[PDB]
Amino acid sequence: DTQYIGRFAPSPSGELHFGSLIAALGSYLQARARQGRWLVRIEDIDPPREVPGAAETILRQLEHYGLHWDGDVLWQSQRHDAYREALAWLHEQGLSYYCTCTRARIQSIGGIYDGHCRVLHHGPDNAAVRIRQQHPVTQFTDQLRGIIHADEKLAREDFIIHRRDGLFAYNLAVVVDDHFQGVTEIVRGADLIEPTVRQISLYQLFGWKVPDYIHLPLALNPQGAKLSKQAPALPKGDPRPVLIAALQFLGQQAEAHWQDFSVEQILQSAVKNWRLTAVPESAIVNSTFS
Ligand SMILES: N[C@@H](CCC(=O)O)C(=O)O
Ligand SMILES: [Zn+2]
């Protein structure tokens, strides 16, 4: 009954590239097709890996490509109190613990945590915070791909919520912020499929409503290899041929003679003609984007 709310949540570790344009465009078109809101959140939660100016570049790029968000941009750098608040609640509820294990130790036992500190009652001193999983989620529904079966060992891990170095974990921040922003459906890149079950486990532990999920096509280079595996910035010039290429990647109708249309017209038509079922599970990008 309530309005659809979707979002694009880029990390400012670089400017937009074709893969992140796919995520922005796919989430935008699905949100607009569903007559819903489309939010933008800057995930600037890791200062060291952030590039000064990149977040602003991204927002400017979105506008250049005709993708206008609703309301104000949320900045994770302004949400640290919210992550702290959620961690405090988990601790009071008996749903988290402090872990003093080294990376060397975890590597030596196969790379997946064994729950060593689960009942040792360490304090927060020089410790990471781990979630105390109860009933890990190992499968989820993707509205496009159907039921996904996750890697069981990774899915069942008491994963990190707050790193030893003090940074809040992505899995924590994304759940806290999507819930805070009232996100009802998460439409995002294929590279984010695996952590989905952990995020769902976390919604369940908070006692919050689990949103819907759509993972967009896996991007391949022309040789058929994963594109994400190690990317040219989006052209600063005419965005139209790039938008047309992105629509084609998403299996949508794409006007070959884009010269007689504005960016806004191309997008308006893309919303009207959006067919989620036409979005493929993988797609090959052209050489211009590899
Ligand atoms: N900033 C993260 C979050 C993605 C998401 O959950 O939509 C990324 O771009 O990889
Ligand atoms: Zn430990």
Side-chain angles (χ1 to χ4, degrees):
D1 181 88
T2 192
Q3 186 171 205
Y4 180 105
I5 300 180
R7 84 297 190 275
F8 175 54
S11 299
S13 52
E15 53 180 294
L16 292 186
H17 50 269
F18 196 69
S20 39
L21 175 64
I22 291 305
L25 181 63
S27 63
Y28 173 94
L29 291 175
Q30 169 77 354
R32 298 307 187 209
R34 290 281 299 271
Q35 299 182 283
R37 312 254 296 162
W38 182 70
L39 310 180
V40 169
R41 173 171 73 240
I42 299 298
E43 298 211 329
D44 61 334
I45 200 179
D46 193 347
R49 279 190 271 282
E50 177 181 9
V51 178
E56 292 75 12
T57 295
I58 292 163
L59 298 177
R60 163 182 77 69
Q61 279 174 303
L62 290 172
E63 292 189 326
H64 185 52
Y65 283 77
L67 302 170
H68 301 287
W69 53 90
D70 300 319
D72 300 329
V73 172
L74 194 73
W75 298 78
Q76 292 194 144
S77 60
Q78 301 183 325
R79 292 280 296 160
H80 288 209
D81 63 323
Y83 310 140
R84 175 208 53 79
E85 175 184 63
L87 288 167
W89 183 91
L90 290 167
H91 188 76
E92 300 178 26
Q93 295 301 112
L95 290 165
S96 69
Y97 57 92
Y98 300 106
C99 167
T100 55
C101 295
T102 62
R103 298 173 179 263
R105 184 194 176 255
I106 308 315
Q107 288 308 295
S108 77
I109 67 176
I112 293 74
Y113 193 59
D114 66 336
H116 182 263
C117 299
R118 203 166 150 115
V119 298
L120 297 187
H121 306 110
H122 295 309
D125 181 31
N126 206 218
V129 181
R130 291 179 179 277
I131 189 68
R132 187 192 315 272
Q133 288 227 59
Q134 304 302 144
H135 293 110
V137 173
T138 59
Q139 308 180 73
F140 77 96
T141 297
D142 186 292
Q143 298 303 142
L144 171 60
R145 298 167 174 265
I147 292 173
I148 299 294
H149 308 88
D151 180 277
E152 295 250 358
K153 255 69 174 182
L154 276 181
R156 294 180 187 282
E157 186 173 19
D158 280 353
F159 56 84
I160 293 172
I161 296 297
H162 197 183
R163 308 201 182 279
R164 198 167 197 169
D165 68 8
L167 295 182
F168 299 100
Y170 161 68
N171 284 150
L172 174 70
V174 74
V175 174
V176 174
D177 286 346
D178 280 336
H179 174 253
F180 172 71
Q181 296 191 279
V183 171
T184 67
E185 185 172 77
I186 292 165
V187 178
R188 67 189 173 188
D191 48 305
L192 299 162
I193 286 179
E194 206 58 32
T196 300
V197 293
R198 288 175 167 196
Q199 296 160 15
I200 298 173
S201 297
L202 190 53
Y203 272 104
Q204 290 181 164
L205 294 175
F206 280 124
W208 292 341
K209 190 181 198 318
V210 177
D212 286 343
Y213 292 90
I214 288 163
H215 297 84
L216 298 169
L218 175 67
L220 307 174
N221 68 26
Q223 289 71 221
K226 283 187 184 187
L227 187 65
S228 66
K229 276 150 51 58
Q230 288 161 326
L234 292 182
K236 277 180 164 65
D238 195 344
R240 290 176 293 180
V242 189
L243 188 57
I244 294 303
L247 291 167
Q248 291 166 338
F249 181 103
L250 291 167
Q252 308 301 120
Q253 299 155 244
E255 172 67 32
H257 307 344
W258 48 262
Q259 291 83 1
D260 290 314
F261 298 98
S262 64
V263 166
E264 62 197 309
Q265 285 177 319
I266 289 165
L267 283 174
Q268 285 170 0
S269 292
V271 173
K272 286 180 181 297
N273 293 321
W274 179 249
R275 303 204 333 108
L276 177 62
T277 57
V279 179
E281 296 169 86
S282 63
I284 295 149
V285 307
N286 54 47
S287 53
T288 296
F289 309 109
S290 180

